[PDB]
């Protein structure tokens, strides 16, 4: 999670995190590309039938 | 936040919100690497299968 | 919200992602030990006999309610500079000693 790891249970810290660009919305996409592939390495080995 | 004024509390939280913001990208980068040989072993596994 | 996060008006069929889910609080509780006194600030600050520099006197202050307002209001101050704390944020923290 973007804000919970860096600025956990704080309000002002979550306000400053928006000024740092769109950095961590790449983290969510980057960590989802890994997430989907792990469902392809399993459907392409065992499910060849 | 409960010890220093808002004028210069942003100097220190800047040094902390950048340390964690880079302590977290490193985890992603080491995760892209680790998903490259598993993808290179689910291709050998999908070959011996 | 899904339309508003993909930057589009027609989203395709599938599971998407959205913002998080944080349960907001209900009320607020503040608890302070017990003490109801006045700290002896009016004694050391207004003493008629200060020490020499080489034989300075160190004083304890314990078990009292500390209010710095009656202190910082002194206009004839020429300096009030603080390192670890800010001068105006000394009215909500409890110090060990």
Name chain B contacts of A31, Cβ cutoff 8 Å.
28, 31
C88 contacts B5? CB cut-off 8 A: yes
Contact C85, B3 (CB under 8 A): yes
**Cα separation of A14 and A16, whole Å?**
6
- 3-state class (DSSP) for residue B27: helix
**Cα separation of B1 and B4, whole Å?**
6
**Cα separation of C57 and C91, whole Å?**
26
B46 contacts A45? CB cut-off 8 A: yes
- Chain C nearest CA to B1, separation (Å): 10
Residue in chain B nearest C89 by alpha carbon: B3
Q: Is B15 on the interface with A (CB under 8 A)?
A: no
**Cα separation of A48 and C75, whole Å?**
85
Helices B9-38 and A24-37, packing angle to 10 deg: 20
Contact C35, C65 (CB under 8 A): yes
A32 contacts C17? CB cut-off 8 A: yes
| Closest by Cα among A19, A20, A29, A27 to A2 | A27
Structure-determination approach: cryo-EM
**Cα separation of C92 and C90, whole Å?**
6
- Chain B nearest CA to A11, separation (Å): 11
- Chain A nearest CA to C22, separation (Å): 10
**Cα separation of B31 and C6, whole Å?**
26
Q: If DSSP states are collapsed to H, E and C, what string results for A5-47?
A: HHCCCCCHHHHHHHHHCCCHHHHHHHHHHHHHHCCCCCCCCCC
Interface of C with B in 68-87 (CB under 8 A): 84-86
Q: If DSSP states are collapsed to H, E and C, what string results for chain C?
A: CHHHHHCCCCCCCCCCCCCCCCCCCCCCCCCCCCCCCCCCHHHHCCCCCCCCCCCCCCCCCCCCCCCCHHHHCCCCCCCCCCCCCCHHHCCCCCCCC
């Amino acid at each position: 999670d973007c804000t919970m790891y860096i600025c956990g249970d704080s309000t002002e810290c979550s306000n400053l995190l928006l000024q740092y660009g769109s950095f961590c919305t790449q983290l969510k996409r980057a960590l989802t590309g890994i997430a989907v592939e792990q469902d392809k390495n399993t459907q392409e080995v065992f499910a060849q039938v | 936040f409960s010890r220093l004024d808002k004028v210069e509390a942003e100097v220190q939280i800047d040094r902390l919100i950048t340390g964690r913001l880079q302590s977290l990208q490193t985890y992603v980068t080491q995760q892209l690497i680790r998903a490259a040989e598993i993808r290179a072993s689910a291709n050998l596994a999908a070959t011996k299968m | 919200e899904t339309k508003c996060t993909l930057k589009s008006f027609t989203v395709e069929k599938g599971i998407y992602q959205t913002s998080n889910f944080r349960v907001q609080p209900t009320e607020s509780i503040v608890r302070f030990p017990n003490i109801t006194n006045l700290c002896p600030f009016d004694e050391v600050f207004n003493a008629t006999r200060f020490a020499s520099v080489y034989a300075w006197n160190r004083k304890r202050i314990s078990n009292c309610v500390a209010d710095y307002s009656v202190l910082y209001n002194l206009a004839p101050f020429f300096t009030f500079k603080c390192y670890g704390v800010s001068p105006t944020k000394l009215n909500d923290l409890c110090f060990t000693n």
